Here is the input.
Amino acid sequence: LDNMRKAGLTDIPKMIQDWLVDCSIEKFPLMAKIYSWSFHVGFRKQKMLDAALDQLKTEYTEDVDDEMYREY
Amino acid sequence: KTIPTFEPKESILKKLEDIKPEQVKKQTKLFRIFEPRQLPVYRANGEKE
Here is the structure.
């Protein structure tokens, strides 16, 4: 929520903040409503390259177990 | 990207029809352990022939 406010969001942290006082499921559909209001803003149609590099970052190490990989 | 090299043991198998029977041993040279050799010799008093 602090990152949420740091981006410039005021009302929607407040709706997520005042709900935690009760954590009730009757007021909860708001969250679900909010959870759907996020996906009606569009696609992040960035470039093939930079979108691949979300995946193509690797940290391969000779410190893992072998007892684990062999069982796997 | 230097990928690590995970090597299993892999336990190389066969099946019965693919078991080769045997190959007989015919003999090579006669399996020596010893050989002769010229050495010098020294008579008593120590000196040499």
